[PDB]
Design an enzyme around this catalytic site. Structure first.
Site, PDB file in Angstrom:
ATOM      1  N   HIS B  43       0.807  -1.218   0.000  1.00 19.36           N
ATOM      2  CA  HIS B  43       0.000   0.000   0.000  1.00 19.36           C
ATOM      3  C   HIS B  43       0.842   1.270   0.000  1.00 19.36           C
ATOM      4  CE1 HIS B  43       0.257  -0.481   4.526  1.00 19.36           C
ATOM      5  NE2 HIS B  43       0.362   0.835   4.472  1.00 19.36           N
ATOM      6  N   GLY B 148       2.926   5.419  10.293  1.00 20.44           N
ATOM      7  CA  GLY B 148       4.295   5.287   9.825  1.00 20.44           C
ATOM      8  C   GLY B 148       4.970   3.981  10.172  1.00 20.44           C
ATOM      9  N   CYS B 150       4.128   0.904   9.301  1.00 24.48           N
ATOM     10  CA  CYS B 150       4.022  -0.228   8.391  1.00 24.48           C
ATOM     11  C   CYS B 150       5.375  -0.587   7.794  1.00 24.48           C
ATOM     12  CB  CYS B 150       3.000   0.067   7.290  1.00 24.48           C
ATOM     13  SG  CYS B 150       1.325   0.029   7.971  1.00 24.48           S
TER      14      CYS B 150
HETATM   15  C1  LIG Z   1       0.900   1.781   8.118  1.00 23.87           C
HETATM   16  O1  LIG Z   1       1.936   2.570   8.690  1.00 23.87           O
HETATM   17  C2  LIG Z   1      -0.378   1.893   8.930  1.00 23.87           C
HETATM   18  C3  LIG Z   1      -0.193   1.375  10.357  1.00 23.87           C
HETATM   19  C4  LIG Z   1      -1.348   1.780  11.270  1.00 23.87           C
HETATM   20  C5  LIG Z   1      -1.489   3.280  11.488  1.00 23.87           C
HETATM   21  C6  LIG Z   1      -1.999   3.403  12.919  1.00 23.87           C
HETATM   22  N1  LIG Z   1      -1.464   2.198  13.546  1.00 23.87           N
HETATM   23  C7  LIG Z   1      -1.205   1.229  12.676  1.00 23.87           C
HETATM   24  O2  LIG Z   1      -0.918   0.055  12.957  1.00 23.87           O
HETATM   25  N2  LIG Z   1      -1.460   1.170   8.264  1.00 23.87           N
HETATM   26  C8  LIG Z   1      -2.559   1.781   7.822  1.00 23.87           C
HETATM   27  O3  LIG Z   1      -2.778   2.973   8.025  1.00 23.87           O
HETATM   28  C9  LIG Z   1      -3.584   0.922   7.081  1.00 23.87           C
HETATM   29  C10 LIG Z   1      -3.405   1.008   5.568  1.00 23.87           C
HETATM   30  C11 LIG Z   1      -4.330   0.079   4.786  1.00 23.87           C
HETATM   31  C12 LIG Z   1      -3.975  -1.374   5.053  1.00 23.87           C
HETATM   32  C13 LIG Z   1      -4.274   0.373   3.295  1.00 23.87           C
HETATM   33  N3  LIG Z   1      -4.938   1.304   7.424  1.00 23.87           N
HETATM   34  C14 LIG Z   1      -5.406   1.075   8.660  1.00 23.87           C
HETATM   35  O4  LIG Z   1      -4.837   0.413   9.499  1.00 23.87           O
HETATM   36  O5  LIG Z   1      -6.602   1.664   8.807  1.00 23.87           O
HETATM   37  C15 LIG Z   1      -7.357   1.306   9.993  1.00 23.87           C
HETATM   38  C16 LIG Z   1      -8.779   1.657   9.679  1.00 23.87           C
HETATM   39  S1  LIG Z   1      -9.472   0.636   8.347  1.00 23.87           S
HETATM   40  C17 LIG Z   1      -9.845  -0.884   9.147  1.00 23.87           C
HETATM   41  C18 LIG Z   1     -10.730  -0.924  10.220  1.00 23.87           C
HETATM   42  C19 LIG Z   1     -11.019  -2.131  10.837  1.00 23.87           C
HETATM   43  C20 LIG Z   1     -10.441  -3.296  10.394  1.00 23.87           C
HETATM   44  C21 LIG Z   1      -9.565  -3.266   9.333  1.00 23.87           C
HETATM   45  C22 LIG Z   1      -9.265  -2.067   8.705  1.00 23.87           C
END
Ligand SMILES: *[C@H](O)[C@H](C[C@@H]1CCNC1=O)NC(=O)[C@H](CC(C)C)NC(=O)OCCSc1ccccc1
Ligand SMILES: *[C@H](O)[C@H](C[C@@H]1CCNC1=O)NC(=O)[C@H](CC(C)C)NC(=O)OCCSc1ccccc1
Lengths: 306, 306
Positions: B43, B148, B150
């Site tokens: 992503h 940040g 991921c």
């Molecule tokens: C990447 O750095 C980031 C990590 C998260 C940010 C806050 N804490 C984390 O672990 N990942 C993301 O922002 C995700 C990107 C997607 C996979 C494209 N999005 C994410 O985690 O969004 C959470 C809300 S959507 C959701 C809600 C419930 C179940 C699944 C997904």
């Protein structure tokens, strides 16, 4: 709801590159190699028949540079030739012929009760695990150390600077651990002799309980927050009779109060009530007060603030 | 009495030397640099207006090697030129012009529910913390990850070989976390799209509860041990109705039974009783069942056996 809190240690690589094995006679343990100096516990000099009451001054004079064998195993290997030796409190300072080419920026500091630090557990000069602990009010830590672990180090990190604060020395009767600061003093009233020692009573770290209650509010868990308030002065009077440390506020705690809109004095009141009983309720999955997370942990892990 | 148990992570230095920053368009996150390959979540290619339903196949074809900027910050710095790119499941495989000179011996593996692994939390390619988690039965972990994070990686270690098992992807509604294995599959039924997702029910990890009860006996705490016994078959029938995983014994558990002289079936009976209530008693300072320590943790930390 998961709280977002874990026991978070610093990355250990900078310190791994400093660990060595020190052998003297029948004893082997770990040392810390910085610049041209290797630090290790002085009981590496002790023969097994003296462990209960060593004469460390006489043991030190009995050593020569040849008495110590220092080896680095992992990473860039080396055998280090000892060219001088000295005692500082409960630590030896060995001078070696090679300066550690991976010496990080570092300082020495003493950690205070309630504060957290990272430990690199090592055996035979090989790092084997890392964990984080808080210094208890009785100057022990609830660690995980086995035979051979002495010389394992504890540290904090500010920016890129490693602040070394702990060198492991011993296990107490209740299974907790203590060690020395790098000025050579043992934490608390302990001595580096293998004899049973009076151990002081532990206490709840009030500032860390406040931090954890703020973590609960930051997670939407606030059933214990009431309009009622206990002043810091009144709480601290209460704390002395109920096995709590006296509360001293910090800017770290103040940030949590500003973020949540819940005053410290509200949480001091809540602690007093929770100590009488949780009445079957849970806070962040626990039915007892938690004091192993600091205000800094909560600011960093939940609020993203370092 | 302290149990001698801490949350113990592996030393992180071998993995720290592999972390890089990957930037694509408006997205930046972490990657893992092994040999001539950088792994990162796919992503990073997603524009913010597509995060809820990306077409990753079309995004991949829209990228060129110039679309990716890869930088190593800490330790031996480098800017890495991408010379090929590919998608494997929910991960990108970027081929770079420089082989990581500090690539450890490594494998890729998938971790199973109840098993523990170490996480190196990173932001902008800079390692910031390490912690250990157990994979939950619903294929989430109770981590500590912010925006940040991921591309942060999880791993186990056998000897000197690092077994990478997790690359961080997302946070679920209840605050837990999940990610991918290095075959590109997400753990569980999750998808790497920013949309609310059904989350499965968690369960107690029975084998880890047994481990913890053995840790209690190893610490002189055995009030819950009775002559009574529940068979594995009977326990597993019970577990399905009471939100426990089915118990599968291992040689790690068998060693704990031999050391303590307490049979597994005695502890399966004790779990059934403890689940109805601790009756105001404590086990290793807790009034609830603990399933975050594995049989291997107990063997290693208490019995000194790896
Ligand atoms: C990447 O750095 C980031 C990590 C998260 C940010 C806050 N804490 C984390 O672990 N990942 C993301 O922002 C995700 C990107 C997607 C996979 C494209 N999005 C994410 O985690 O969004 C959470 C809300 S959507 C959701 C809600 C419930 C179940 C699944 C997904
Ligand atoms: C050094 O590797 C070792 C570390 C301990 C072994 C088991 N776990 C440990 O943390 N330290 C020692 O063995 C100590 C050496 C002394 C300081 C010369 N001895 C020790 O811890 O003995 C414990 C029994 S004596 C005792 C009892 C109660 C309070 C204080 C000391």
């Amino acid at each position: 709801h998961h709280s977002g809190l874990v026991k978070m240690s610093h990355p250990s690589g900078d310190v791994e590159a400093c660990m060595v094995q020190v052998t003297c006679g029948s004893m082997t343990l770990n040392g810390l190699w910085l610049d041209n100096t290797v630090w290790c516990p002085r009981h590496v000099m002790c023969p097994a028949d003296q462990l209960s009451d060593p004469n460390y001054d006489a043991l030190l004079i009995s050593m020569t540079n040849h008495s110590f064998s220092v080896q680095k195993h992992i990473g860039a290997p080396a055998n280090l030739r000892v060219v001088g030796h000295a005692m500082q409190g409960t630590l030896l300072k060995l001078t070696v012929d090679v300066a550690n080419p991976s010496t990080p920026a570092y300082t020495f500091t003493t950690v205070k009760p309630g504060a957290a630090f990272s430990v690199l557990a090592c055996y035979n000069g090989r790092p084997t695990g890392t964990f984080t602990v808080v210094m208890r009010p009785n100057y022990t830590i609830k660690g995980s150390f086995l035979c051979g672990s002495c010389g394992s180090v504890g540290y904090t990190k500010e920016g890129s600077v490693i602040n070394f604060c702990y060198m492991h020395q011993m296990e107490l009767a209740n299974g907790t651990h203590t060690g020395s600061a790098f000025d050579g003093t043992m934490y608390g009233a302990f001595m580096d002799k293998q004899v049973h020692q009076v151990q002081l009573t532990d206490k709840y770290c009030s500032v860390n309980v406040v931090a954890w209650l703020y973590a609960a509010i930051l997670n939407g868990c606030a059933w214990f927050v009431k309009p009622n308030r206990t002043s810091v002065v009144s709480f601290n009077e209460w704390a002395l009779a109920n096995q709590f440390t006296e509360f001293v506020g910090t800017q770290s705690v103040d940030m949590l109060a500003v973020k949540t809109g819940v005053a410290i004095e509200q949480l001091l009141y809540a602690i007093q009530q929770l100590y009488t009983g949780f009445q079957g309720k849970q806070i962040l999955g626990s039915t007892m007060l938690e004091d192993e997370f600091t205000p800094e942990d909560v600011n960093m892990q939940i609020m993203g603030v370092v």
